[PDB]
Design a protein around this ligand. Structure first.
Ligand SMILES: [Co+2]
Ligand SMILES: [Co+2]
Ligand SMILES: [Co+2]
Ligand SMILES: [Co+2]
Lengths: 132, 15
């Protein structure tokens, strides 16, 4: 189908300041933080948008931190309990009343192996859309 | 990429 206009070409989510002591134990994590993607001006006949996710993963399968903090990975989910690790897809319906589509998502940091170290958190997840 | 999500934050040292 014909494509929509990507409204949110870049989106940021700031996990803020996390604390090494709170991320010392294996399995520790931050709270979930929202982020969303939006498409607009969806042509008549286009009723579904599929987002395909990609980004650098580490040995836990989650997204790798590219910042200086060690032993931190990043988890992306949708709003329904599905993890969207690299290669995942998510499909949503176009809202005909507004000719728009949106993807409500959430991100957290977690330390699978424990012992997160001080430094920055930086990661980028890329999304390509297909239309049907 | 059509969109990019940038994740930011900082791990502070409190032991
Ligand atoms: Co926060
Ligand atoms: Co900040
Ligand atoms: Co929040
Ligand atoms: Co919604």
């Amino acid at each position: 189908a014909k494509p929509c206009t990507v409204s949110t070409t870049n989106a940021t989510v700031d996990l803020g300041d996390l604390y090494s002591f709170s991320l010392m134990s294996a399995g520790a994590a931050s709270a979930w933080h929202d982020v969303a993607l939006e498409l607009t001006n969806c042509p008549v006949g286009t009723s579904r948008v599929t987002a395909s996710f990609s980004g650098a993963a580490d040995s836990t399968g989650y997204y790798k931190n590219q910042g200086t903090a060690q032993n931190i990975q990043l988890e992306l989910q949708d709003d329904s309990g599905n993890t969207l690790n690299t290669g995942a897809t998510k499909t949503v319906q176009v809202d005909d009343s507004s000719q728009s589509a949106h993807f409500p998502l959430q991100v957290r940091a977690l330390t699978v192996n424990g012992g997160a170290t001080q430094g920055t958190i930086e990661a980028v997840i890329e999304i390509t859309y297909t239309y049907s | 990429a059509d969109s990019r999500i940038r994740i930011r934050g900082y791990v502070r040292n409190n032991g």
